[PDB]
Amino acid sequence: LAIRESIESEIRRERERQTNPSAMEVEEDDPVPEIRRDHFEEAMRFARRSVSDNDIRK
Amino acid sequence: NRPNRLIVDEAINEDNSVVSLSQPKMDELQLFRGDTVLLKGKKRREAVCIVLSDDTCSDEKIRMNRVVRNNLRVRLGDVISIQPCPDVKYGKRIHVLPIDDTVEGITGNLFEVYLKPYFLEAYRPIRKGDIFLVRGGMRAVEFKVVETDPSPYCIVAPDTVIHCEGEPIKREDEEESLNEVGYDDIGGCRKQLAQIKEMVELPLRHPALFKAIGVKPPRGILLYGPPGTGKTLIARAVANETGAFFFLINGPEIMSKLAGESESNLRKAFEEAEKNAPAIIFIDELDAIAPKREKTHGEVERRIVSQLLTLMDGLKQRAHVIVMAATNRPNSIDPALRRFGRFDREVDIGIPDATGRLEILQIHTKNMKLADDVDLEQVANETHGHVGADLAALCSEAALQAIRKKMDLIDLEDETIDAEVMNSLAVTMDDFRWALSQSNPSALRETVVEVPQVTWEDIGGLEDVKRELQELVQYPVEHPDKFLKFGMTPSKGVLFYGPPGCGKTLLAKAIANECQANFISIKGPELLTMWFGESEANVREIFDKARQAAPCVLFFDELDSIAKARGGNIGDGGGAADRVINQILTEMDGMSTKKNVFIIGATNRPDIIDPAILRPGRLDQLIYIPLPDEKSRVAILKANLRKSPVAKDVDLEFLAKMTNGFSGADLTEICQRACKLAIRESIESEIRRERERQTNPSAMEVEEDDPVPEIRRDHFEEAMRFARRSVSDNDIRKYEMFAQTLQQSRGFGSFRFPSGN
Numbered sequence A: 001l002a003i004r005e006s007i008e009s010e011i012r013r014e015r016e017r018q019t020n021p022s023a024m025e026v027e028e029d030d031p032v033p034e035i036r037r038d039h040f041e042e043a044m045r046f047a048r049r050s051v052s053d054n055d056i057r058k
Numbered sequence B: 001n002r003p004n005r006l007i008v009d010e011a012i013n014e015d016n017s018v019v020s021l022s023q024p025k026m027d028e029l030q031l032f033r034g035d036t037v038l039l040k041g042k043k044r045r046e047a048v049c050i051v052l053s054d055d056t057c058s059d060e061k062i063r064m065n066r067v068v069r070n071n072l073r074v075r076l077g078d079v080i081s082i083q084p085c086p087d088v089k090y091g092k093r094i095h096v097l098p099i100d101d102t103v104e105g106i107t108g109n110l111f112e113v114y115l116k117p118y119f120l121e122a123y124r125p126i127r128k129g130d131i132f133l134v135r136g137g138m139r140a141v142e143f144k145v146v147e148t149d150p151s152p153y154c155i156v157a158p159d160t161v162i163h164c165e166g167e168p169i170k171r172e173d174e175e176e177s178l179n180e181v182g183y184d185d186i187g188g189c190r191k192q193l194a195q196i197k198e199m200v201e202l203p204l205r206h207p208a209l210f211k212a213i214g215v216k217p218p219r220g221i222l223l224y225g226p227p228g229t230g231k232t233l234i235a236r237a238v239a240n241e242t243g244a245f246f247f248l249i250n251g252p253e254i255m256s257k258l259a260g261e262s263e264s265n266l267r268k269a270f271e272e273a274e275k276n277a278p279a280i281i282f283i284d285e286l287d288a289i290a291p292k293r294e295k296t297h298g299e300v301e302r303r304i305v306s307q308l309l310t311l312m313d314g315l316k317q318r319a320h321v322i323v324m325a326a327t328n329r330p331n332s333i334d335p336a337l338r339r340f341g342r343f344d345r346e347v348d349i350g351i352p353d354a355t356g357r358l359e360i361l362q363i364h365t366k367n368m369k370l371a372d373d374v375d376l377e378q379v380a381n382e383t384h385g386h387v388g389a390d391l392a393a394l395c396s397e398a399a400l401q402a403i404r405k406k407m408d409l410i411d412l413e414d415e416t417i418d419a420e421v422m423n424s425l426a427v428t429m430d431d432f433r434w435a436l437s438q439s440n441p442s443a444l445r446e447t448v449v450e451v452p453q454v455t456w457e458d459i460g461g462l463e464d465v466k467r468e469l470q471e472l473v474q475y476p477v478e479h480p481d482k483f484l485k486f487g488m489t490p491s492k493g494v495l496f497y498g499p500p501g502c503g504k505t506l507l508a509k510a511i512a513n514e515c516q517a518n519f520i521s522i523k524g525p526e527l528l529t530m531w532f533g534e535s536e537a538n539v540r541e542i543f544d545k546a547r548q549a550a551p552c553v554l555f556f557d558e559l560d561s562i563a564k565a566r567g568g569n570i571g572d573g574g575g576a577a578d579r580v581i582n583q584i585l586t587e588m589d590g591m592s593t594k595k596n597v598f599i600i601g602a603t604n605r606p607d608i609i610d611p612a613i614l615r616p617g618r619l620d621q622l623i624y625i626p627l628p629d630e631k632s633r634v635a636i637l638k639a640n641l642r643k644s645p646v647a648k649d650v651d652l653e654f655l656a657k658m659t660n661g662f663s664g665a666d667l668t669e670i671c672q673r674a675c676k677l678a679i680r681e682s683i684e685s686e687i688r689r690e691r692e693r694q695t696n697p698s699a700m701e702v703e704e705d706d707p708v709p710e711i712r713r714d715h716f717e718e719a720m721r722f723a724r725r726s727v728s729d730n731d732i733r734k735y736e737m738f739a740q741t742l743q744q745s746r747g748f749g750s751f752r753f754p755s756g757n
């Protein structure tokens, strides 16, 4: 999720901003993301248990 | 239609000189609640009263006490003119005399014991010629106002002296007493008493008017219920209210006679009742006279049944005679008495509920003096399955325990009689707590038909389920006109399904509370009892009770019981066949849709159910109820712990986060286990602190005198490690699979009508 957010931010910020630039270079020059709270908070709802109860009882 | 003319109505307040009126009639008549008004009735007899205001009082009618009612020679439905008097001043002397038949057992002075707190602080307006009643001291006694020096309309002041010198005199022969019973002595059956008033009053009160109407009356009314519900009392009360010539017929008194004497008694009874028209004939224990045809062996009893059938049909002469009859069950009667022109109107007097039981306890504890320890409301909540005669016997037993335990009061009256000793005795709470242990009720086997008390607040979440249930139940009751406009048939039933212990019974009781309807619950053991005993003809007897209590919610719990017990859709070779489910389907197809009887089933195994139930016109809605979510778990933990003292240090919102995948029963289990830990800690602290401290005490008493525990953090913290999940993962996957086998659609989500030109 973090890699997808970083790539889809970078493509828009570089290409979609201006083709012919107003400033000489990119004014930001900063990678935005790191792995933070909302990424775990979103990836939690896909997690599942691999081992059921009867298997543990065996 | 001038507003001083008023029609007599029953009053709720029990004060002996207070009447009540409505607000706009009083504003039109221009009176105030501080006024002391004067009433005029028949035979030039008056009654001065204090009027007040009310919102439950009707406009054209006045509410008054039965004491004021019998002191005017006026019954209900009559007219009374009212005159305001600001000339009502104070009195000079008050001379009243006791009446002999009410003082046959009491003795001593009645002045300070009864009459002094009676006129205290109430400012009672009395009149020469009135008779009032005083309760208290395990006796009710009446006093006639014999002689007053001033004008007859007067207010009793505390300065006015009251003279009680004279012999107890007899009454006038036209005067009434407490020998007969009125409408106040009956509690818990307001609807049935209203129905009997509607059937009986308008023909009997106005015989010439109703004869000019020309519409035929009912002439046979069949009261039935469990034994001890007070049917004889209701009949005697209606007979005393209407004042018609009441004649009593008792079954065993007829059947104890010889051969011709029974027919002679019946014929003389109906002749002497037809002479004194209008009249009421009451036949008690009808099944002792006319049972079923198979049970009346012999000739003479069948001859008596035919005599009764002859006289009931020959009663149709327009003779203003109404015949009532009581029985213990409607099935034992000879079915020839059910025909038209005979006993066709049927009134069901069921067992009373908690408000009714509270009213019965308030009726039976009028005369008995009462200590302030007791709470009759808790007593009425704890008495379950109690008919009113059981409650009267319970009050009797508590009073006898209170008289028994005071053996020093047995020493206080060895053979002498003092009214002050009975005045000095009251009944504690532990007498009632003892009498609940030696009470053997008689109505545990009966089906309970009442409105539930569970609200939506006890259930957490399930908002779309709540919306769909109120759409399916509440809307055809409130708005039938929309269903008439758009023209559809409202659905008849709902099948819930899901994992065990997730609030299906609570949802049924909640929607029954929301719509204010009766609720009839039928568990799995009753269906299995009908299946083993092959007594499936009781299902029609269930649906008849459902029709008699409409609107109603009929709840079949564990509808898969017989299918699970048979082979689990595996053994015996058959498939989805049953005696009992067949009879349920027949009764569902039989009933009309106008009665507003709504049927709800509930299973845990929806695969092994009979598929013929799920057809249209039957249980056709399927609602899935999953395991509760987090906010639902918060609300369940709140609803379980309202009775218990929980310390405010406890975090329930953290408690609902850990318990991913519990049901409701697991949460109730862990709450009750923490409660057990708290009780053990309290008892093993109290025993050590009381006994182990000192046998011979240093101080005079216990220096602490403080119960230590409440339910706190370490109790939940300890009871958590015993909790377990009841429902495994594969079981949940089975319900998800069955939920997907009834899936909506594939590819029809993008349907649109074409829009051209």
Ligand SMILES: Nc1ncnc2c1ncn2[C@@H]1O[C@H](COP(=O)(O)OP(=O)(O)OP(O)(O)=S)[C@@H](O)[C@H]1O
Residues within 6 Å of the ligand: B185, B186, B187, B188, B226, B227, B228, B229, B230, B231, B232, B233, B234, B328, B352, B360, B363, B387, B388, B389, B390, B392
């Ligand atoms: N709802 C009630 N209101 C007032 N008194 C009641 C009520 N239920 C029972 N009682 C009392 O309990 C007794 C019941 O007497 P009954 O009128 O004979 O009852 P019942 O239903 O007629 O019993 P059966 O069928 O004739 S044996 C009387 O003392 C009543 O005063």
Ligand SMILES: Nc1ncnc2c1ncn2[C@@H]1O[C@H](COP(=O)(O)OP(=O)(O)O)[C@@H](O)[C@H]1O
Residues within 6 Å of the ligand: B458, B459, B460, B461, B499, B500, B501, B502, B503, B504, B505, B506, B602, B635, B636, B639, B640, B664, B665, B668
């Ligand atoms: N919405 C809810 N709120 C609170 N408690 C609930 C809820 N649903 C179920 N329960 C718990 O479930 C128990 C009753 O379950 P029940 O209705 O008998 O399930 P079933 O119908 O499967 O037997 C109650 O003790 C109650 O605490």
Ligand SMILES: [Mg+2]
Residues within 6 Å of the ligand: B232, B284, B285, B326
């Ligand atoms: Mg009887």
